[PDB]
Design an enzyme around this catalytic site. Structure first.
Site, mmCIF file in Angstrom:
data_model
loop_
_atom_site.group_PDB
_atom_site.id
_atom_site.type_symbol
_atom_site.label_atom_id
_atom_site.label_comp_id
_atom_site.label_asym_id
_atom_site.label_seq_id
_atom_site.Cartn_x
_atom_site.Cartn_y
_atom_site.Cartn_z
ATOM 1 N N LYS A 13 94.234 19.195 -58.544
ATOM 2 C CA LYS A 13 93.196 20.073 -58.027
ATOM 3 C C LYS A 13 93.515 21.529 -58.369
ATOM 4 O O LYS A 13 94.683 21.930 -58.383
ATOM 5 C CB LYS A 13 93.070 19.892 -56.514
ATOM 6 C CG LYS A 13 92.758 21.149 -55.712
ATOM 7 C CD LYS A 13 92.229 20.794 -54.329
ATOM 8 C CE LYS A 13 92.101 22.024 -53.447
ATOM 9 N NZ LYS A 13 91.298 23.096 -54.098
ATOM 10 N N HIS B 221 85.824 18.268 -48.714
ATOM 11 C CA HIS B 221 85.975 17.463 -47.506
ATOM 12 C C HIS B 221 84.636 17.173 -46.838
ATOM 13 O O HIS B 221 84.250 16.011 -46.680
ATOM 14 C CB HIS B 221 86.922 18.163 -46.528
ATOM 15 C CG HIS B 221 87.593 17.234 -45.566
ATOM 16 N ND1 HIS B 221 88.530 17.659 -44.649
ATOM 17 C CD2 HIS B 221 87.466 15.899 -45.380
ATOM 18 C CE1 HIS B 221 88.949 16.627 -43.939
ATOM 19 N NE2 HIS B 221 88.320 15.547 -44.362
#
Lengths: 457, 457, 458, 457
Positions: A127, A219
């Site tokens: 990431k 998320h």
């Protein structure tokens, strides 16, 4: 379950991330009768060493951060032919490198020819994956020209294998909840993720990230897809991602012309946390004294299909909140009658982070001689990170890793508010809240204008 | 709430059921500052005593059976001239003499002329009210020609004003449980009333009643009407009784040609109860040694309208059962998709006699790594006779007392089984069961042949 | 099929409302073997005549207003002692006098004992029955103290008993129309009754009634109850009235506080109707040159229960409209999706006065390479007096065409706020006039257009 | 919608299909203003006559067939060297020679490198495509080893483009037909395709094909998938196929164990057709006088999801039926309340072949004085082959051509029936029906045993 023997390699020099965290994770699972003894974890970096000068480096961090108690091929990246210098013929690659190193690092690897097999080799990426819609699309094109969509693993977030399966069995194995998940009975939905820590040492990363590129896209966009999708035909890994992708193609912001009814931001001030004072965001080390860098973020979404028409969704996240929680709240309509003058709407909650469980609230009569109603509750508790990812990489099941199709579909939804927020402005109009306060005062008018209010967690 | 001054004229208050029960109830009601201090009680029986005898009898009855520390007039029952011998002018009568003395008494009392005031006189009748559909219809004609609609109170059963109101608020004030209360989601319903003691000293009365006129018509037919009615426009006394009649007009037995798929009877014999042996029904004192009277009854009904089509109802009651309970159980369908393995269907029960509250059951994932489901529970408790009957009669409430339309409508559905079970037969084909056993073995096949099972309490 | 022998005592004042309206109907249907010839008509009035003068008067009107080719009594109405001493013992009474007389004429009837039988006497009454909520209750109290429930027949609107049974079978015998008859799929409903005739020659009854006591309470409240009622257990006469009453107890006007979002009135002026110069309302004989009696009336109601929550109803009626129609229109929601390739709502109608039939509009693709949509429809037609059938059922007893004593008092309650406001004296220059030949007075168009809808063109 | 200029490369044009049928279609399209003026056609065959003799076969195939009033080669079939002898850089191939030459031809055509870029050439394969599930999976592997998707077009059947769009607009643009399209209101569905012709001259092909591989896997599967599918997100070429594939993964033959409640076969004999005698099946040229090939088929499928749980589907097709008709019929349930006398259930039809339209049957009261219902009808008419298939290939579209997933998914459903009827058996067990009769007598018990009847088209 009994992963096949292979060979693992590492990239990105000798950063402390792999040695202190990733290497102990493999060692811990090794002494559990899970991985075969034939692993031969080959090391690789960008610094001169020897086969024995780095073997003690593993012991330098394994016992210093975990319970405690292998060939080196260091070369030189600054050469376009260094890769030529580099069991059962299986390999797994790691890309723990700088953000601006992937397009260099995949092109030459593909030109070498190592990644020319569909089963022997796999590649994982670290990431983040791009910074906007255009940057992710360009990176996806490079990957498609070197590999297939079966050997690429992207590490964006970790939700948990047992948390996803807990939700799927609840909705799709009960004949009492599915008929109530539609526009005819539901009023609105709320999703919340809270934290009680500020940026501790990652001041150099959070400065260019904000709160929309950090948690909202990764998320909160995955909890939203699980509570709004259609029943799949099977629990197979590729039978759920199709339904998750299909619902992201009907999602849009509530208002596009006026970007104030569908988004707020914020930044925390100095205050009281845990009985002790804490400094403000702009006074922390490594942070420019005049920066915007949103920490809070609230959005409103709408879905246009035969099931979720007219039902809005509210998303909220932030830092330095009073407590650490995560919840999903579904609120139903008001009763279609008024013979009971006395009636609060019914709410069904789904706790995730603090204590997994299910709650349900309804109305009951108050004892006495006059018709008055109260509010009662029902409860149920289930109890009363890197370890799981590597196992799934070894076996080869891809359900915690996002597809290349839904990565570019989440960047499209948040495009307007983003492009509005990176635009430079006066560094004196940013809403502020104290460290220990739920939300800035500007975010309270976003939901109150519709006649509702946030949930006191 | 506050009653008004009046005078009682209890007929035959010399034998029993009045001195030890009615007088202590009135005394305790007056002691708690409920009844106004303007009230007179007058006896009327076939005795030749004086006032002092009545006072001493009342004192003895109150002291013997209650916590402890008005005129009399003799009269006959077979002569119009007798009634000629017999505050604010209000009067309330009471007929508790015998099961053969209602029509003469009502006719003579109406002919004499005391019962001619719409708002000043009321009359009550003791249980029972008829023995067949024709016998109940005839008694209504006599009442209709002497009395008004709001002047007759029939005492058959007691449910309590708090049990009926706790069930209306739960159903009609929630937006969750109403959409699922129809034929598209429900499988079947069950109603059970159990007892642990039977025929202590009432062998004379129980010989000519059986468990079809004792509990099935009165008690089990009022719990069934509240579970199948439509939402009323208010909670007024008339507004609710109008929806209970509309349900009894569409109810029928499942089988009418063959009376074996819609009815079972039984009787109890010697067994063990509470660690002690008990005698059988036929060897009990006061009972014919070759009786054919049932102490058990199971029935199956069907409702034919737009909401309850195809959903059967199961009713069960008896004596000398292991436990003392009362419950209603609603079971839902099975989920169409079979992508899940083990799936018991959901149930939702409302406890009454054993405890007051709500029970729910659904499926949750078993912890581990394999997809297995485990049933869980949710609970909620509200907590943790012949005294309210005398209070609501002073004021004007038409709720605890049944109407004249439901009496003749509850006698119609049980007509086919009443006639068949009444015909003489040899006393060697009755399905006996032991004292301490739930049901006879013949009652197991009535529900088992449909693929279901009796709920175990 | 056939009634029982009886004796009739029609006439109360010997007026021009029975000779050419009532007794021709009995004679006309006596020639088709519909009822046995075992009755004797008795005439009661305040005039003095002979047994042949009555027959001559009846003949003067039987052949002049029908297909063409009876013991009279005299005395006084207030003293029926002589009249008392007049086929089995069956009687049916009639009243055709002024409203102020009903209490005098019905209080003394029960004093003499003429009405002391359950099933041998009928006390049918004329129209109207009261003028407001308080006036109807007083008349109901007097009736309840003399007669029984199944003895009083109130003459009101006429539906024919064949239109009523056409809707019951359509709704309740099909498993394709009931699931869509609730709040989750319907947008709004409309009801319209139109006419092409003015006040004609009455000019004395309309001056004290207006179009709120004339058509709105009687007619438009029965088409509204049949469209919003729950299914009954049977088609029995007394099993449908319960469901009709249960709906009127949850009905209220929207925006009670401000009586401008739930009601408009109007009046018609001079204009062209059939190519002729029709005069205005305040120009016809018998009408005051400055009157404020409504001729048009539009209302908006809302029902509050588990089925019709949030669905408004629109009611419209008037006089001197371009055409004579009656209709019920149901409009459904829009599709919860937008067609996508890189939509007018559906309407279901039910015609009554214009024609007995069904209609249904939906959307179909336009032919060609593109996928534009059309508006196609499907049709169905059934076919492709009042004081002659409403009168012959009192001999047998209907309990269906005659309203009950509960809904009469329940229909007077919903229209009470607008009845009081429109009765207060007001400047006679603010009435919303409209031309004789147009639909609305142009102020009732904002009542519906404010919510984003439109009246049907019809 | 003007196609881009290209060069045609028809393969095996020496047959009686290209010049007789395909070439006149291209000529007629070129007469209009649709086809581009720059379109070069190259002829391929097995023989070599001249470079102008190919231009005279056009004169005998167009001047007398369609409307009245170019190169050549002599390449081999299986030789690597022979392919070396072979506007803009665009081409389109047309492989139609025989049902056993696809693999070697495809392999040798892809070996030369003629398919190396995304969009320069297309390959179309003539029917049939496989014979069994195993024989169809192997051909897909060969295709994937030479080229990719979007470059291959499979010709199976021809459902008009207008018909599909007419069906889609009707269902998804109306708010009164979607709520009733589920298991709660529908009883069963029937699909019928009928013809009035025999095998004609294609006796050599129908012998090894049967009525299960014709119009049951190609035609009747596409009509079945359009009725049981979920609403798409958007009308698109690759958005309807995703929903059509998701339905074929849930269907299955009912009662798999006993292959007699889910399938019947037949064969026609001598009879009367159009007032003229017609011969039987085993009396025509080219047919073995003891053949067991079916010309009839009736199946019964079941879908298992949240929408079609418990609703059966009936499929019927055949030859030499009395009339040519195609239709889809949906029948609803019966009303619960039975207070109305005679109530036939409602039916909704969708006529396709003779003339397109919509029908709807409901019940209305019969005029009179007594309650009696009638049956009425409502109508709507829209009006009141190898032409478009040769246009979507040039223009480029993937809506009329099937996908790779659907080919292998339709072969799986009919596998148990196909593998059973293929086994050898005695010739005197074949069901027979007359030429002019709807169905054999054995096919009338498949549906009548559930209390139903075939429609009377």
């Amino acid at each position: 379950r009994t992963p096949e023997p292979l060979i693992l390699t590492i990239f990105g020099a000798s950063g402390d991330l792999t040695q202190r965290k990733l290497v102990p994770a493999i060692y811990q699972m090794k002494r559990e009768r899970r991985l075969p003894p034939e692993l031969t974890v080959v090391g690789f970096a960008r610094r001169d060493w020897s086969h024995d000068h780095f073997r003690e480096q593993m012991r330098k961090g394994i016992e210093e951060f975990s319970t405690g108690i292998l060939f080196y091929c260091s070369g030189n990246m600054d050469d376009p032919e260094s890769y030529l210098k580099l069991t059962r013929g299986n390999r797994v690659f790691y890309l723990a490198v700088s953000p601006n190193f992937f397009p260099p690092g995949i092109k030459q690897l593909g030109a070498a020819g190592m990644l020319s097999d569909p089963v022997k080799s796999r590649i994982v990426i670290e990431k983040p994956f791009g910074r906007d819609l255009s940057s992710a699309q360009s990176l996806n094109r490079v990957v498609q020209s070197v590999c297939k969509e079966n050997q690429v693993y992207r590490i964006d977030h970790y939700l948990g294998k047992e948390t996803v399966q807990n939700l799927m069995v609840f909705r799709f194995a009960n004949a009492i909840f599915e008929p109530l998940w539609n526009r005819q009975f539901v009023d609105h939905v709320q999703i919340t993720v809270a934290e009680t820590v500020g940026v501790e040492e990652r001041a150099g990363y959070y400065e260019s990230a904000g709160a929309l590129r950090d948690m909202v896209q990764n998320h909160l966009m995955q909890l939203f897809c699980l509570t709004a999708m259609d029943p799949p035909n099977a629990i197979d890994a590729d039978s759920i991602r199709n339904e998750k992708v299909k619902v992201l193609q009907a999602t849009r912001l509530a208002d596009i012309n006026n970007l104030e009814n569908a988004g707020i931001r914020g930044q925390y001030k100095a205050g009281w946390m845990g009985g002790k004072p804490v400094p403000g965001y702009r006074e922390e080390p490594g942070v420019d004294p005049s920066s915007t860098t949103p920490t809070f973020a609230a959005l409103k979404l709408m879905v246009d299909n035969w099931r979720w028409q007219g039902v809005p969704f509210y998303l909220r996240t932030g830092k330095r909140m009073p407590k650490k929680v995560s919840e999903i709240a579904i609120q139903f309509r008001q009763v279609p009658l008024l013979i009971f003058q006395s009636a609060n709407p019914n709410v069904l909650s789904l706790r995730i982070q603090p204590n997994e469980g299910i709650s349900l609230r309804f109305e009951a009569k108050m004892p006495g001689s006059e018709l008055r109603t109260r509010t009662v509750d029902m409860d149920f508790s289930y109890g009363s990170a890197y370890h799981r990812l590597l196992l799934d990489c070894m076996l080869g099941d891809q359900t915690l890793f996002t597809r290349a199709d839904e990565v570019e579909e989440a960047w499209r939804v948040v495009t307007p508010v983003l492009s509005a927020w990176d635009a430079p402005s006066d560094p004196l109009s940013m809403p502020l809240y104290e460290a220990g306060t739920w939300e800035p005062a500007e975010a309270e008018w976003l939901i109150n204008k519709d006649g509702r209010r946030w949930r006191r967690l």
